[PDB]
Design a protein around this ligand. Structure first.
Ligand SMILES: NC(=O)c1ccc[n+]([C@@H]2O[C@H](COP(=O)([O-])OP(=O)(O)OC[C@H]3O[C@@H](n4cnc5c(N)ncnc54)[C@H](OP(=O)(O)O)[C@@H]3O)[C@@H](O)[C@H]2O)c1
Ligand SMILES: Cc1ccc(C(=O)c2ccc(CC(=O)O)n2C)cc1
Length: 316
């Protein structure tokens, strides 16, 4: 299978990338160095992860050492919710660039459709605990992203956690300049996303699947939660192919024409997660994995459920 797919800005995106959410700042530099050494060309980052400086240290070292060329890397980041105001977008992007030590991003995503009140707090709360919204709508934030493209700061722009109506809102924006190149959404056998994926792909929007392993390190994990990596049905499929369960879970979205971004700080797993290009899941395997859908979410953005733009009320 090809290592990259074509986006609608004319650029190629590596279908496998390294996730950084929850990667401790003390381990993430090594994690990214190892990833690049073992063949990863695509790194998924966010300002809200508060690790971008350390990730940047890794990228910069690998560039300086000429292990890789900048043009061979695909570096993605995301605009946090407290930055949706038009006057804050450029600055947010520039802070991310400075931390990553880059002069451009290959892809910059609106992290969530929900804008929040600007300030130091990433999740500003009222006295009663609800998130305080921004009055900036998704379409104006989109115009600000487009400006980032026209200023040379980012090669492509996209969205994340947009439901199909919100994607539709962007595609229908009056005077729309650039279409979203990507929608990055949670996807795995317990949330299969057939509808949203089909819609985006029908529009020429590439989908990136996050939490492909079910995010076993998520802070809110509970024992009664389903566990992909421990699912004996999935372990049986892996066993049949002489691969690991994680490898199956990574190959799964690839064969759906999705980009996938498993996260690890463990060097051995970083390497293991990358050799997915040497085997194929059967159509039967694929349909079987799809049959496991429970509509179960790792990231439900639970503090935002009353936000006018909360993505997950809608079926898809
Ligand atoms: N746009 C968004 O809103 C959004 C939301 C969530 C995630 N994301 C992106 O998607 C990335 C991946 O999602 P995620 O971090 O939620 O979780 P994930 O990639 O599904 O799972 C990461 C967890 O799996 C473990 N793991 C990795 N490889 C393994 C293997 N081969 N065998 C066993 N365990 C393995 C990791 O452990 P170690 O790290 O200890 O090895 C870590 O605890 C994130 O890092 C982030 O970049 C984006
Ligand atoms: C209670 C609470 C509130 C907010 C967070 C939080 O900041 C959060 C939730 C999901 C994610 C991953 C992503 O959006 O990429 N983050 C970074 C976590 C926990």
């Amino acid at each position: 299978m090809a290592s990259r797919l074509l986006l609608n800005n004319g650029a190629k995106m590596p279908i496998l990338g390294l996730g950084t959410w929850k990667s401790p700042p003390g381990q993430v530099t090594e994690a990214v160095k190892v990833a690049i050494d073992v063949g990863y060309r695509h790194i998924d980052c966010a300002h809200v992860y508060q690790n971008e400086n350390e990730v940047g240290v890794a990228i910069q070292e690998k560039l300086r050492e000429q292990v890789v060329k900048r043009e061979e890397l695909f570096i993605v980041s995301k605009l946090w919710c407290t930055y949706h105001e038009k006057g804050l977008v450029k600055g947010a992007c520039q802070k991310t660039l400075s931390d990553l030590k880059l002069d451009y991003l290959d892809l910059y995503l609106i992290h969530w459709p929900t804008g929040f009140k600007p300030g130091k707090e990433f999740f500003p709360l009222d006295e009663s605990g609800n998130v305080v919204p921004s009055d900036t709508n998704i379409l104006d934030t989109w115009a600000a992203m487009e400006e980032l493209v026209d200023e040379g700061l980012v090669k492509a722009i996209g969205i994340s956690n947009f439901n199909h109506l919100q994607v539709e809102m962007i595609l229908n924006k009056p005077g729309l300049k650039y279409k979203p190149a990507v929608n990055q959404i949670e996807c795995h056998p317990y949330l299969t996303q057939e509808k949203l994926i089909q819609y985006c792909q029908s529009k020429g929007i590439v989908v990136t699947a996050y939490s492909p392993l079910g995010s076993p390190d998520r802070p809110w994990a509970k024992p009664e939660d389903p566990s992909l990596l421990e699912d004996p049905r999935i372990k049986a499929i892996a066993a049949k192919h002489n691969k690991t369960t994680a490898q199956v879970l990574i190959r799964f979205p690839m064969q759906r024409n999705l980009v996938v971004i498993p996260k690890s700080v463990t060097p051995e797993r970083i390497a293991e997660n990358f050799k997915v290009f040497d085997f194929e899941l059967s159509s039967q395997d694929m349909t079987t994995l799809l049959s496991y859908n429970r509509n179960w979410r790792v990231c439900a953005l639970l503090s935002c459920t009353s936000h006018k733009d909360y993505p997950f009320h809608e079926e898809f």
